[PDB]
């Protein structure tokens, strides 16, 4: 969790917020129970407490975001390490939230030119948007830089 | 600017007095050998100064030299407390510098020897100023919790540094973290401030306003901090129930729509100048309100107040077209050029009862022009003229036309009942400012709105840089045209007879509205044709047809930001009414407490579709389970736009 | 609205009863240790209600509590049958809530204890309305088959869940899946439903239309469902042979067009409003017909119908300029300004046969105005007046000009044979409409079609946001120009001699078509120059020269919809003639059967190029 | 702009422009004219490294 960047916490926090069902900042066996029996398989109220209490460091029975982060330290994103792509993203991202959206990237090309139509911008996203939310992660942006 | 220059001379002077006085220079280059062989026998000089009155201890932290720093505390165990006696760096202690350079071992060495953890770094560079490069407050805890070294932040609390600590702006450490731009660590650290303390039950420490009276939740509305605003929204966001893809969410809404007590976050947004704060209006617990508050109430009350203005000008137009007029009072037009066969009446004509009906038509006006002055002048004393002659469009220049309107009507009232002659002139500015002030009521229309933003954004910004160009050229050719025709008849081809006509006729050939002078009965002078054709190319097909391209240059480069202006025009129209209308007819927004078991605050209910998307969460669930062509070209250029 | 606030008050009152009534709170918190104590010696209470009249089973179902519902099924085994009963929620049962929250082990429990799988979800929130978010039909099979829980789909059919099921809107379970926008599964979930269509009667479960008569093949095209349309198309596409890269395939064409009774899919496409229901024209069997129906048959009949129209308006125009006129009946130019030396005839002079040759000419153009009313009064007879004054461009405002042109000529017929003076007024509108109505035939041309839509888009869309800016600025300076020249001669420099002239003069100084009031023999009043120079800047180089950039901004930004509309302008022109021209000259498009052993469905041949090995 | 600054600098006498920057030889510096610029690192790139 130490050698992260701004684009990896701000990515994981929206992953955590969608994962935390009731929005309490913690994770129970109920809350991890709901979004796994939606995923076809059925955790039979035993792997829930086996998985959470495995990674629960302070032993409170719950998983806050840093203990969520230290499990995403061992299950971290791969060795896709760059430096120039780190710079041009903060050039691209206005508010610095790690998410370059349809409203923010349409302005960067407006500073550069060629007169993009509004529907041309949204097609630039769906080529890049792997998970399908209309916004481009840094991981979803770094594969669009070289790409071949 | 001889101030910032005077910084430099006191910074190169430090880099003279360190080449002198060798116990500084042995301290800079980490020379443990000379430091023993300058102090351990005679010494006599441990309390030296510098350009900032600093110490050798201040050098050994400013350059990361642990080794001499341990020895200087061992040799002279009294240097840790004295601050920098200076002007720029005033009050700065050696506890501060070891923090900002991340130097954990030295901080662990200074605190074990023990320094004042609440020292006042009250220097001149440290003020929140638009020229300096960092603003880190004044306290070592504030310097700790800004660079992000959270392990230091755990340590300063354990030796007793209070969170409750205000600078000259009254800011706590919570107000500081909103101001740094590299945000995204502070959200990981804002919780860590709350984890240890925040009091237990004093005020919960997030409520403490600054010297300008503002909690951190209001402060994120002014500073445009989008990440903190979502992160502070998690505290006041209550999830009610889930139903498949539907979840209903109930918001606190305590400070967002305080509805009075004019420190309101809807009030504070349309007051500021920071452009990046105006995009709070797209975050989902606020844009629900200003959709409702404007559609159910702010739309009909605005248009009804729109229609009451439309009759008022028609009540003023229909009376100005019925001035009284005497035919050619006593004179006879002698010389020339006096096609003026009427004359207005003296004030001895209110006979003929199709003239008393005029009198109510002028009396509705003069009592209508004072109610503008009864409602705009009580705005200059609460808020200065920097809102009036400031062209912040959220209540822009339509608050200075209407005041000029309410002045120009009453001048005619003084022109009447005096028998003064020229009442045409104040009445003429009364009409053209009268009708063009209905343009303000083109603000709350879905269609007519963002066109009106563009007309104002071409007056001040793309016509000013034309009219300075036009007044150069048109002063040249007019005096050139006047000289040619000075030795000519004005009877035939008389567009230029005296000089202040010769600007005005030349003003109307740059616009192609008069035809350009020509008389084929007579012989025009040979220098006219050469001069005028040279003017014809520059005026007609080189300065006007450049201006049309100039408009279309800037019309597709702000049509993402006039819609964002137009949305903020509506909210500034909405919130202005609620302060101004009496609250017998606007209900309070949302649902109150104390009838439900709620807790007296006014809540609001938002319910939305979350989509599940099946792909991103299965990627994480495989980590939760521990295991054992046109678009491509636009990204090809964007790679080539990244420029290696 | 006042209605949407009622949903707020109940859903907060729904939570208030949970803070009261301790077993419901014990049901929400999954509290089982209190629930044994609150029941197993006293109890007294079990048929509780709430704000929506639900039970503790429903509370234990809306929050995922298998343990809490376990005790409730054991305590009172008659909770599973009664539904919710309120205004918003009505008829919803605990089987429904357990389905949408994916709780497989709970649905397994409720069917074992006995739950009604035909429970009508007839509530108020469930109706297909835009102010509601999700629409899942009514039956608990539909709630499973929409969110994609295909395990529970298999679980329900084993316990007698009928596939044939219609809601209050007539929709079946296959009409529903076409309507969810987050499609993603409904290709796959479609086929699992037909995998349970093994034994039925002759109506094979897709020939069952909705309440408004629309099968799920028809519903896919009307709703703009590109993904499901091609999935349906693979069922009725027959592949004839492959030959290297040439694959010739047949298409069904039984409901693609087959324009033979009332509800052809080409008729349904160009009537709707949805932006994505118009790109079905992109897909591969439809883009062939509307080409071939137009190119061989639709194009030349449309020009003959056009070239007969121009000769009609000329025959009306050629009898318009030959009106009967007398020289100056009775008066003599009395005050001033009587530039009028003529008078029309009384209708007692049709002598001199080049005044009678016109009389056979107007009778051509007086029956031409009858036949236009006979073809458009039977158009409101079938579909309402909101088709006219709705802005549907697919046959746009060219149905309100041609009626007015028909309506204006009869007024001339009324102004004739009564001897009334003013009768240039219909004939002036008769020509400015009767010529501007040949613009309708600029439609089926390759180069002149998509220009016409741009003219139609700037009339309303980008001049109803300039005329409200024009009429304000004019109303200032026209009234201001009146006051200046009020105490002046209208003889010399007489642009403003009364106020109804004073708008008409100022309106054209805004457009820069008159020059600009100037005389140099006389001395103009000094406030004229300051006022007019501010008028010339704001109008000529700030308003008109803004509007040229206003067009050019919106010109290149929508020139991918005019090429979509123009193609759909052709299609709605094509089908308009198919239901109107009698079948002696349009054959049925395609190839029939029964000469070939085929099955009598009209077919069509398509051959393409596979470009892989 | 730069073609206008430099056109005026050599043309107006240097009793009203001064020389730009800080001179040497007052400090032990070496008689040249120096100039000072300070900027912020923007420590995002420091976090990847963190003295490694
Ligand atoms: Ca959670
Ligand atoms: Ca925990
Ligand atoms: Ca963003
Ligand atoms: Ca994404
Ligand atoms: Ca002319």
Curated annotation (Swiss-Prot), chain A:
**Where does the chain bind Ca(2+) 2?**
56, 58, 60, 62, 67
Q: What is the lineage of its organism?
A: Eukaryota, Metazoa, Chordata, Craniata, Vertebrata
Q: Which CDD domains match?
A: EFh (cd00051)
Task: Report the locations given in the UniProt record.
Answer: Cytoplasm, Cytoskeleton, Spindle; Cytoplasm, Cytoskeleton, Spindle pole; Cytoplasm, Cytoskeleton, Microtubule organizing center, Centrosome; Cell projection, Cilium, Flagellum
Indicate what this protein is called per its UniProt record: Calmodulin-1
Q: Which GO terms describe its biological process?
A: autophagosome membrane docking; calcineurin-mediated signaling; cellular response to interferon-beta; cellular response to type II interferon; detection of calcium ion; G protein-coupled receptor signaling pathway; G2/M transition of mitotic cell cycle; long-term synaptic potentiation
Q: Which GO terms describe its cellular component?
A: calcium channel complex; calyx of Held; catalytic complex; centrosome; cytoplasm; cytosol; extracellular region; myelin sheath
Molecular function terms in GO for this entry?
adenylate cyclase activator activity; calcium channel inhibitor activity; calcium channel regulator activity; calcium ion binding; calcium-dependent protein binding; protein kinase binding; protein phosphatase activator activity; protein serine/threonine kinase activator activity
Keyword check for Calcium:
yes
> Sites of the modification N6-methyllysine?
115
Q: Where is this region: Necessary and sufficient for interaction with PCP4?
A: 76-148
Residue positions where Phosphoserine is found in the record: 81, 101
Query: Record-annotated residues binding Ca(2+) 1?
Result: 20, 22, 24, 26, 31
Into which family does the record put it?
Belongs to the calmodulin family.
Stored PANTHER family: CALMODULIN LIKE 3 (PTHR23048:SF0), MYOSIN LIGHT CHAIN 1, 3 (PTHR23048)
Domain statement: The N-terminal and C-terminal lobes of CALM bind to the C-terminus of KCNQ1 in a clamp-like conformation. Binding of CALM C-terminus to KCNQ1 is calcium-independent but is essential for assembly of the structure. Binding of CALM N-terminus to KCNQ1 is calcium-dependent and regulates electrophysiological activity of the channel. The C-lobe interacts with KCNN4 channels in a calcium-independent manner, whereas the N-lobe interacts with the S4-S5 linker of KCNN4 in a calcium-dependent manner playing a role as calcium sensor and gating the channel.
Curated annotation (Swiss-Prot), chain B:
Q: Name one GO molecular function term.
A: metal ion binding
Instruction: Please list the residue ranges covered by the ANK repeats.
Output: 18-48, 52-81, 90-119, 136-165, 169-210, 212-241
Phosphotyrosine modification sites?
Answer: 135-136
Residues carrying sugar: 331
Record's catalysed reaction(s): Ca(2+)(in) = Ca(2+)(out)
Question: What spans does the record annotate as topological domain Extracellular, numbered to this chain?
Answer: 322-358, 417-422, 486-498, 519-529
Please describe, based on the UniProt annotation, the reported consequence of changing residue 135 to F.
Prevents up-regulation of the channel by phosphorylation
What GO cellular-component annotations does this UniProt entry give?
A: apical plasma membrane; calcium channel complex; plasma membrane
Instruction: Kindly give the Gene3D superfamilies that the UniProt entry links to this protein.
Output: Ankyrin repeat-containing domain
Family to which this protein belongs: Belongs to the transient receptor (TC 1.A.4) family. TrpV subfamily. TRPV6 sub-subfamily.
This protein's name? Transient receptor potential cation channel subfamily V member 6
The record lists the organism as Rattus norvegicus
User: What gene name is listed for this protein?
Assistant: Trpv6
Curated annotation (Swiss-Prot), chain D:
- Signal peptide region: none
Annotated segments matching region Interaction with S100A10: 2-6
Superkingdom in the source lineage: Eukaryota
For this chain, the Swiss-Prot or TrEMBL PTM comment says: Glycosylated.
Which cellular compartments is it found in? Cell membrane
The text of the family note is:
Belongs to the transient receptor (TC 1.A.4) family. TrpV subfamily. TRPV6 sub-subfamily.
Task: Summarize the subunit comment.
Answer: Homotetramer. Probably also forms heterotetramers with TRPV5. Interacts with TRPV5. Interacts with S100A10 and probably with the ANAX2-S100A10 heterotetramer. The interaction with S100A10 is required for the trafficking to the plasma membrane. Interacts with calmodulin. Interacts with BSPRY. Interacts with TCAF1 and TCAF2.
Primary role: Calcium selective cation channel that mediates Ca(2+) uptake in various tissues, including the intestine. Important for normal Ca(2+) ion homeostasis in the body, including bone and skin. The channel is activated by low internal calcium level, probably including intracellular calcium store depletion, and the current exhibits an inward rectification. Inactivation includes both a rapid Ca(2+)-dependent and a slower Ca(2+)-calmodulin-dependent mechanism; the latter may be regulated by phosphorylation. In vitro, is slowly inhibited by Mg(2+) in a voltage-independent manner.
This one is known as Transient receptor potential cation channel subfamily V member 6
What portion of the full-length protein is represented by this chain?
636 to 687 of 767
């Amino acid at each position: 969790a130490d050698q992260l960047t701004e684009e990896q916490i701000a990515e994981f926090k929206e992953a955590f917020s969608l994962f935390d069902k009731d929005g309490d900042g913690t994770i129970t066996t109920k809350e991890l129970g709901t979004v796994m029996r939606s995923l076809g398989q059925n955790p039979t109220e035993a792997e829930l407490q086996d998985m959470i209490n495995e990674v629960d460091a302070d032993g409170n029975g719950t998983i806050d975001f840093p203990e969520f982060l230290t499990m995403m330290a061992r299950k971290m994103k791969d060795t896709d390490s760059e430096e120039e792509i780190r710079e041009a993203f903060r050039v691209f991202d206005k508010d610095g939230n790690g998410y370059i959206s349809a409203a923010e990237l349409r302005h960067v090309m407006t500073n550069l030119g060629e007169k993009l139509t509004d529907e041309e911008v949204d097609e630039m996203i769906r080529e890049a948007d792997i998970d399908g939310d209309g916004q481009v992660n840094y991981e979803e942006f770094v594969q669009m830089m070289t790409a071949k | 600017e001889s101030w910032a220059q005077s910084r430099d001379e006191q910074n190169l002077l430090q880099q003279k007095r360190i080449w002198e006085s060798p116990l500084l220079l042995a301290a800079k280059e980490n020379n443990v050998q000379a430091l023993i062989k300058l102090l351990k026998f005679e010494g006599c000089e441990v309390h030296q100064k510098g350009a900032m009155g600093e110490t050798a201890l201040h050098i050994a932290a400013l350059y990361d030299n642990l080794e001499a720093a341990m020895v200087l505390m061992e040799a002279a165990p009294e240097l840790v407390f004295e601050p920098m006696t200076s002007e720029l760096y005033e009050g700065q202690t050696a506890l501060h510098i070891a923090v900002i350079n991340q130097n954990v071992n030295l901080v662990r060495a200074l605190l074990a020897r023990g320094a004042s953890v609440s020292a006042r770094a009250t220097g001149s560079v440290f003020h929140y100023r638009p020229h300096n490069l960092i603003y880190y407050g004044e306290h070592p805890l504030s310097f700790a919790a800004c660079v992000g070294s959270e392990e230091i932040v755990r340590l300063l609390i354990e030796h007793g540094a209070d969170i409750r600590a205000q600078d000259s702006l009254g800011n706590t450490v919570l107000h500081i973290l909103i101001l740094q731009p590299n945000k995204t660590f502070a959200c990981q650290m804002y919780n860590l401030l709350l984890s240890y303390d925040g009091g237990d039950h004093l005020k919960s420490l997030e409520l403490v306003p600054n010297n300008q009276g503002l909690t951190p939740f209001k402060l994120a509305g002014v500073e445009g901090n989008i990440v903190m605003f979502q992160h502070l929204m998690q505290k006041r966001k209550h999830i009610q129930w889930t139903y498949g893809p539907l979840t209903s969410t109930l918001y606190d809404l305590t400070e967002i729509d305080s509805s009075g007590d004019d420190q309101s976050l809807l009030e504070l947004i349309v007051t500021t100048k920071k452009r990046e704060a105006r995009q709070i209006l797209d975050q989902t617990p606020v844009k629900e309100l200003v959709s409702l508050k404007w559609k159910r109430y702010g739309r009909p009350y605005f248009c009804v107040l729109g229609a009451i203005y439309v009759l008022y000008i028609i009540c003023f137009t229909m009376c100005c077209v019925y001035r009284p007029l005497k035919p050619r009072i006593t004179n006879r037009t002698n010389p020339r050029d006096n096609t003026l066969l009427q004359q207005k009446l003296l004030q001895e004509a209110y006979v003929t009862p199709k003239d008393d009906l005029r009198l109510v038509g002028e009396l509705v006006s003069i009592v209508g022009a004072v109610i503008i002055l009864l409602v705009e002048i009580p705005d200059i004393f609460r808020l200065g003229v920097t809102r009036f002659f400031g062209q912040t469009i959220l209540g822009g220049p339509f608050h200075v036309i209407i005041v000029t309107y309410a002045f120009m009507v009453l001048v005619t009232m003084v022109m009447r009942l005096t028998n003064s002659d020229g009442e045409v002139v104040p009445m003429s500015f009364a009409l053209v400012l009268g009708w063009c002030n209905v343009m303000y009521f083109a603000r709350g229309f879905q269609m007519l709105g963002p066109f009106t933003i563009m007309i104002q954004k071409m007056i001040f910004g793309d016509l000013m840089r034309f009219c300075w160009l036009m007044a150069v050229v048109i002063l040249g050719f007019a005096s050139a045209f006047y000289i040619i025709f000075q030795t000519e008849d004005p009877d035939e081809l008389g567009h230029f007879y005296d000089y202040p006509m010769a600007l005005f006729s030349t003003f109307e050939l740059f616009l192609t509205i008069i035809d350009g002078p020509a008389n084929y009965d007579v012989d025009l002078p040979f220098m006219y044709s050469i001069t005028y054709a040279a003017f014809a190319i520059i005026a007609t097909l080189l300065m006007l047809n450049l201006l049309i391209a100039m408009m279309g240059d800037t019309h597709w480069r702000v049509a993402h930001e006039r819609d964002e202006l137009w949305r903020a025009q509506v909210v500034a129209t909405t919130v202005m009414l609620e302060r101004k209308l009496p609250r017998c007819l606007w209900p309070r927004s949302g649902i109150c407490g104390r009838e439900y078991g709620l807790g007296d605050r006014w809540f609001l209910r938002v319910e939305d579709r979350q989509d599940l998307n099946r792909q991103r969460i299965r990627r994480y669930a495989q980590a939760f389970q521990q295991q054992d062509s046109r678009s491509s070209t636009n990204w090809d250029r964007l790679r080539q736009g990244a420029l290696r």
